[PDB]
Amino acid sequence: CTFANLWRLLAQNC
Amino acid sequence: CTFANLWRLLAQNC
Amino acid sequence: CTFANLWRLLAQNC
Amino acid sequence: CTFANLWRLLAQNC
């Protein structure tokens, strides 16, 4: 549950 | 690319 | 400023 | 449950 994982998902989906 | 989707994908770990 | 905190704050809506 | 609210909370907390 990290900012890193948020950025990863934003990069993958947006 | 919706926040609801990302929030749900992050739910397991958060 | 932690993603865990933001995810929890957004649980109210998501 | 929106990107807009995520950004608001990021601005407030980070």
Author numbering:
A (entry chain A), B (entry chain B), C (entry chain C), D (entry chain D): 1 to 14
Study authors write:
Concurrent with alanine scanning and CD analyses, we also determined the three-dimensional structure of the CV1 dimer at 1.0 Å resolution. The asymmetric unit is composed of two interacting dimers. In contrast to the previously proposed dimer interface involving tryptophan residues, the structure of each dimer in the crystal structure reveals a canonical knobs-into-holes packing between Leu6, Leu9, and Leu10 as expected for a dimer of α-helices. The helical portion of each peptide is capped at the N-terminus by Thr2. Cysteine residues extend beyond the helical segment of each peptide to form bridging disulfide bonds. Asn5 and Asn13 form long-range hydrogen bonding interactions within each dimer, which is consistent with the slightly decreased stability of the N5A and N13A dimers relative to CV1 in CD experiments. For each dimer, one of the Phe3 residues and both Trp7 residues are oriented away from the dimer interface, suggesting a limited role for these residues in dimerization/disulfide bond formation. While not contributing to individual dimers, the Phe3 and Trp7 residues appear to stabilize a dimer of dimers in the asymmetric unit and help to rationalize several observations from previous and current CD data. The interface between dimers resembles a hydrophobic protein core and is composed of four copies each of Phe3, Leu6, Trp7, and Leu10. The Trp7 residues form two types of interactions: the Trp7 residues from chains B and C form a parallel displaced stacking arrangement at a distance of approximately 3.2 Å (left) while the Trp7 residues from chains A and D are parallel to each other but interacting with other hydrophobic core residues instead of each other (right).
Recently, Victorio and Sawyer reported the surprising, spontaneous formation of disulfide-linked dimers from a p53-derived bisthiol peptide called CV1 (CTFANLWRLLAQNC) using a mild aqueous buffer and dimethyl sulfoxide (DMSO) as oxidant. This peptide is derived from SAH-p53–8, a stapled variant of the N-terminal segment of the p53 protein that interacts with the proteins Mdm2 and MdmX. In initial studies, dimers of the CV1 peptide were determined to be exclusively antiparallel with no detectable formation of competing parallel dimers or intramolecular disulfide species. Dimerization was dependent on α-helical folding of CV1, yielding highly α-helical dimers.
